[PDB]
């Protein structure tokens, strides 16, 4: 009941980004493979005829 | 005709604490002083009727 005396409390910023959990990954890369494809046919354009 | 302040009063409470003090002396003194008009009626009565 008098000016100033007080009790503290302290508090922190916690979620996934804070605590950098965010830059868990626990994935290892495949080992990419690539095969042809096939291309078909023609489009209109706005060129006019 | 008083400001209006732009930041926070600090240490208010003490403020307040000499305020109600400044309040209660004036208030007993007043109170007093009637303690000195009871006894001056006490003794007119006396002397009126001497």
Known sequence: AN???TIDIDLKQINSQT???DTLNVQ???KVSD???TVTG???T???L | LAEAAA???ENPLQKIDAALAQVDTLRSDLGAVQN???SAITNLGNTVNN
């Open chain 1, 42 to 44: 023609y489009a209109d």
């Open chain 2, 36 to 38: 000195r008009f009871n």
């Open chain 2, 7 to 9: 930041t926070t009063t």
């Open chain 1, 28 to 30: 290892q890369k495949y």
């Open chain 1, 3 to 5: 000016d100033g005396e």
């Open chain 1, 35 to 37: 095969t042809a494809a």
């Open chain 1, 19 to 21: 605590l950098g959990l």
């Open chain 1, 46 to 48: 706005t060129i006019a």
